[PDB]
């Protein structure tokens, strides 16, 4: 079983680029991170920051999650992110995505020891 901390890193971290490299970034990344294996994941966000800066968010401001849970944390700085949304003509197994770049505060839910992000909750 992949851990929840490892799954967050696979689904949401891209420390290798400062921002989406092209309008095909999401098509490429949703495939290579295996987010289209048995269905098209309808939306996803990648964070273009170091793993240490995103893990640090779990020590920053404690806030409510989108669903009202209270183990969420909001980043002190805005972070570079890419939002991936499935296109209307996308049809598993042939998944297609629109790439949109943003720079926003991120909110993540954290768990565990070590206490790390296990869920990307929102950008604000």
């Amino acid at each position, epitope marked *: 079983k992949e851990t929840a901390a490892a799954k967050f890193e696979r689904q949401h971290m891209d420390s290798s680029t400062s921002a989406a490299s092209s309008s095909n970034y999401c098509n490429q990344m949703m495939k290579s991170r295996n987010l289209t294996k048995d269905r098209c994941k309808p939306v996803n966000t990648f964070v273009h920051e170091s793993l240490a800066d995103v893990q640090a968010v779990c020590s920053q*401001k*404690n806030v409510a999650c989108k669903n009202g*849970q*209270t*183990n969420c944390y909001q980043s002190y700085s805005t972070m570079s992110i890419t939002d991936c949304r499935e296109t209307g003509s996308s049809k598993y197994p042939n998944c297609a995505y629109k790439t949109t770049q943003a720079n926003k505060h991120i909110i993540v839910a954290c*768990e565990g020891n070590p*206490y790390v992000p296990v869920h990307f909750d929102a950008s604000v």
Partner: nanobody
Amino acid sequence: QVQLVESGGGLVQAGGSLRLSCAASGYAYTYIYMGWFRQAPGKEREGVAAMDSGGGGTLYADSVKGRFTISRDKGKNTVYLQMDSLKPEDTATYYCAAGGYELRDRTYGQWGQGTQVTVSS
């Protein structure tokens, strides 16, 4: 550095009462949930009581309902546990925790060093 400073607890006779206290220092914001967990030797850590910073969302383990009472100073990072009618099975190390949700220990990221509570017979 955040420090959760716990006080109180210790040795008491079965049937007796004790209070535990915990004040967080070093955190620049408000922890929405704080709580009390406990672990006996050899057993898994268990949530005892938790409360949110508005004085609501109060939750207790079934085995302490009616006997234990949690409280916080409204809007601040302090939490207290009054324990009455103590039983030998309440003997454990008790931990304050901050920053999680309800009684789910995996969600809490800041932990006190732990305070022994010993209930004798």
